[PDB]
Amino acid sequence: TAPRIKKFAIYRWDPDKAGDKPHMQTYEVDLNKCGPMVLDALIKIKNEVDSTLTFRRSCREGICGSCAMNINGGNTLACTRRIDTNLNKVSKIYPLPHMYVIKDLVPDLSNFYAQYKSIEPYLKKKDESQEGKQQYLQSIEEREKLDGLYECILCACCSTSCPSYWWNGDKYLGPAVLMQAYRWMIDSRDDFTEERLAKLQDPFSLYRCHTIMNCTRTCPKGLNPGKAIAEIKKMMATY
Amino acid sequence: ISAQYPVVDHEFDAVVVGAGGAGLRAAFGLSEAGFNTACVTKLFPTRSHTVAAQGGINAALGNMEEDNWRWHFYDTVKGSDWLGDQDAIHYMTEQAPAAVVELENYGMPFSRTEDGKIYQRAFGGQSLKFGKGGQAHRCCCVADRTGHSLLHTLYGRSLRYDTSYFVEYFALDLLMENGECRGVIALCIEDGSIHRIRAKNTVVATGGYGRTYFSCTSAHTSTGDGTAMITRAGLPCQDLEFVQFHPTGIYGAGCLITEGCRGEGGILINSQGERFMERYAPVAKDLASRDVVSRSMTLEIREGRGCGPEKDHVYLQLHHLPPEQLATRLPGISETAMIFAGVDVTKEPIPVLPTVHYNMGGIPTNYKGQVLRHVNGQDQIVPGLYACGEAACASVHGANRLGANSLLDLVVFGRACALSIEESCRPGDKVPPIKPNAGEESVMNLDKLRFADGSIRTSELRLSMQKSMQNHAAVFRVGSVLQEGCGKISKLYGDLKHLKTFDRGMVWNTDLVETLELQNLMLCALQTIYGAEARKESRGAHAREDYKVRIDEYDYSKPIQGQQKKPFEEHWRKHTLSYVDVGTGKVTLEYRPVIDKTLNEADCATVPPAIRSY
Amino acid sequence: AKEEMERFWNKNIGSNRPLSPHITIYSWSLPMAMSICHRGTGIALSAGVSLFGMSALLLPGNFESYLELVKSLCLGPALIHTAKFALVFPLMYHTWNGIRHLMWDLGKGLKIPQLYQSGVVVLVLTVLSSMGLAAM
Amino acid sequence: SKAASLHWTSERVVSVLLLGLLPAAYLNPCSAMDYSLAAALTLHGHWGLGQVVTDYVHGDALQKAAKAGLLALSALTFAGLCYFNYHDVGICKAVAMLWKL
């Protein structure tokens, strides 16, 4: 009764429409016949109004980071961002900032993933003949070191908010990939911690971070990529 | 249709159609062995529904207390309701220790005990001393984020090998010639190009089909794609009718509240604030089979004990657990509960209701992952075709899956597919010359759907079946209604020709990717509703009111000495092999016998069917 | 991989794909404007120092001569106590933020609730110091 | 080698150095402390500007040129600072004077 209709300005761009220029389409969504988060408005516009709105979605609980976008000026997983029930505003749904768009809201993340691959995100042991035979021992105090660090969902919300990744994302790895590098470095079972550091000894891979700390705020998971990057720098100095 | 779609042909040693836990384990196995593998995934690997899997892997590693893998075997067998293959159950429970060890040796951050070993917990259906004992501690958990850490460890660990991922490619059909499989034909979602990844061994690890139901804990991408590729290739499915409805799913969102929380001490309470898990499970109590607990929770509201404002859900109490335990082992459900239900686990209880969670059925495989045919009453192996994970039915779960056995399923049988491939084939085997128009029917269907002017939208045929299955194939079933459902589903299937799509582009046409996922969901729904209507017994998760008894070749409640062995055609202890004529949409149902002999009869003898009372 | 990154740039540079908006759409977090103003105050301070050493090398005369040159055209007690503030506020701001960034380098104070107390502190000490400095 | 972590560290040392070398200039002015302050500010500024350049001048061709013109602006700023120090009142006195009116 008395429907509440919120406006949603959403960044559109169609690759197949010749000469299409990025624009903003508005969709008044009724807030009573939809869920509470922003991904519920988007899935409603796609199932009931405009069946061409393209975005990535998969879990709808914020555990996988496919719905990462720029809602109201902040990189936040759309499945966990509540709709502002103040109906005098127009939500500004935008793709991740400074990233090539495949269609409307879907950014080209393949460089983000290639950079993740480049840091070697796997356990490296000097003696790998005993792999799979015995439970590598690790203390509860040495296992606590990886808290807040292994829970990254690789949603790029942090990397695409970093002004240094905007400018030099060709060579800078960004807060997410660097945080993961750190994670690996301080895994008590890894045996390449003085060789994972060596790989960052160029003026760009790690040393484009200047502690803007714009990655720790945007992290939808409440992690802290910039403190990780700081620990990495203190490890690169005090070997 | 034709040259409006140029086809890019690839040749690999092995193709894995999936990048969940099972698909990643299998791709990693093949690539590590040496095979030129290719993972075709429609989601970035770490995007797979595996991530939604709070709750460790079961494994009989004896850290907390002396444990044996034979007790885990027994537990499994019993919880399956004797409709599981005790040879695949034997293999899995025997390889679970070494599988979780290899997983910890890859970097998976398992929670550690005071001695520096993997911290295990207690779930529903586990025991010690072949039941006679009490609750056991075998669940090797990564601090309530086990599926996330599994997926990330396996993916990053496959980056170490030449695993050529095809990320965001939709697999449309298998390339079957002369009864064997030569790979898959896939759709690149990014540019709309058709790709034919030819191989010598296909592993189908596509997950379940939970989106066949209105309310599900499952992702938007659980659409039964591999099960339907198998249906559209002339191969059967198996035990589709059995659908686990996890009891502890959020009332509104349908999110997961980890059966671990219960295993930690959490309790289920009705409107009267009583632990009804005693009247039903005097020993198992809260930690019981996810079929007994779900139906009991249904049989609390059915009789009017719902503690909801609308009286349609029960509470799960966790505030009686210390805050340190709540946040040290269950850090994820705290967030989930707060960010969705707004419930603070440390203060007020969480609203919970049974929603569709796991599909015990799927593609019939053996204990090696090899997909099975059924020709003249014999089990014939489809050459070059493997299945693993939720998509497969090796019947290690039978009628009911035990908690934490599904992640174990993924790792152990991804390993099984990889090991079987590396023992049956050599890296470099020349791919046979496939015909020059293989997979044309898939491209012609993709075209007929991209330019599908019609009447009924694709979102409406979904909601239609989703609510016809939520009403007619729910926890409790009855012929008089399972036939109304069969009718409704057959009719909605017929209406798959009156479909209307709006997006006519090629780049990221998700209206096409979703009409294709609806063609797969309607094939998994036809079979599940018909196998459920036909199964005139009550076993495991299939509970029928008009036949409230588990029929077996004997009356195992009574002594089986003077009993006459009921013929295979009468008793219902047999797997439902389902087929669908994809043109007419008619489902023919065959029946296969359950494999009882274990891998080594001397090692662990067959567990005789008994009265599965918890 | 290198090949994957070369292929991402070779494909996206040469394509028609647009680059999503960033600085216009992105809200300005305080510390982001506090870092852009630390880069601006640094370039400014460096420009000053540099043109003062060039002047020193080329400009003819003495500093006391140019000083009395500006003194001659008397300005008053207000333009002086404002030009000083406008000439030292960049230096103070910068120096304080510098100490902030050195604290951050030792990996301290890098929790969201703290970057805003640090912000406020820095800006306060900026003003407070600037004034005090130009009240000498 | 460690030529990026050695840089990062050398810049933090110079920073803290300048941080201490500025107030001590007020406490006890000296001509040698003028010369050390000149070298401090010219190395801090050269490295800072270096960073700016590295961030904004994309292209290895143009970058090297910009850094050479920056090492020249710096190699002359330091020259004028030392000249002034030796032929005028020095940075401490100069400042004090311009801060007398």
Ligand SMILES: Cc1cc2nc3c(=O)[nH]c(=O)nc-3n(C[C@H](O)[C@H](O)[C@H](O)COP(=O)(O)OP(=O)(O)OC[C@H]3O[C@@H](n4cnc5c(N)ncnc54)[C@H](O)[C@@H]3O)c2cc1C
């Ligand atoms: C909310 C939730 C919580 C769970 N918690 C637990 C737990 O605590 N413990 C436990 O043991 N189990 C748990 N499970 C169950 C278990 O984790 C899943 O059954 C398991 O992750 C499925 O593995 P899979 O790889 O077969 O499927 P998925 O992990 O879902 O992977 C399927 C893959 O197939 C791909 N795919 C599908 N269709 C296509 C297509 N047409 N073309 C190309 N690629 C395709 C997808 O992109 C994906 O990569 C949970 C399940 C859910 C839903």
Ligand SMILES: CCCCCCCCCCCCCCCCCC(=O)O[C@@H](COC(=O)CCCCCCCCCCCCCCC)COP(=O)(O)OCCN
């Ligand atoms: C490199 C040359 C730069 C020239 C700087 C002049 C103009 C810029 C203004 C900012 C610097 C001056 C403010 C600092 C407070 C000065 C207080 C003062 O006069 O006291 C001492 C100031 O002189 C010093 O010794 C220290 C001088 C520090 C100057 C450092 C300058 C470095 C960078 C300046 C660039 C600013 C450019 C800004 C552009 C936006 C003098 O000693 P005293 O007679 O008071 O008593 C001491 C013994 N009894």
Ligand code: HEM
């Ligand atoms: C007074 C004490 C000072 C401290 C503690 C200090 C500290 C810093 C720090 C920590 C940085 C950041 C370096 C990087 O980005 O990683 C910086 C940048 C910079 N500083 Fe200073 N500084 C001081 C004074 C000065 C002075 C007097 C000048 C003038 C020449 C100056 C010029 C610069 C420049 C040009 C930059 C580069 C801008 C940028 O990189 O952000 N600094 N300073």
Ligand SMILES: COC1=C(OC)C(=O)C(CC=C(C)C)=C(C)C1=O
């Ligand atoms: C603090 O981080 C940031 C910068 O750091 C120097 C910027 O330059 C910019 C962009 C501004 C200019 C003048 C290039 C932004 C938006 C920013 O957040």
Ligand code: SF4
């Ligand atoms: S670190 Fe935080 S934001 Fe950055 S990628 Fe991982 S989760 Fe997403």
Ligand code: F3S
């Ligand atoms: S915001 Fe960017 S500049 Fe560094 S501190 Fe985080 S990576």
Ligand code: FES
């Ligand atoms: S949909 Fe998976 S993170 Fe929002």
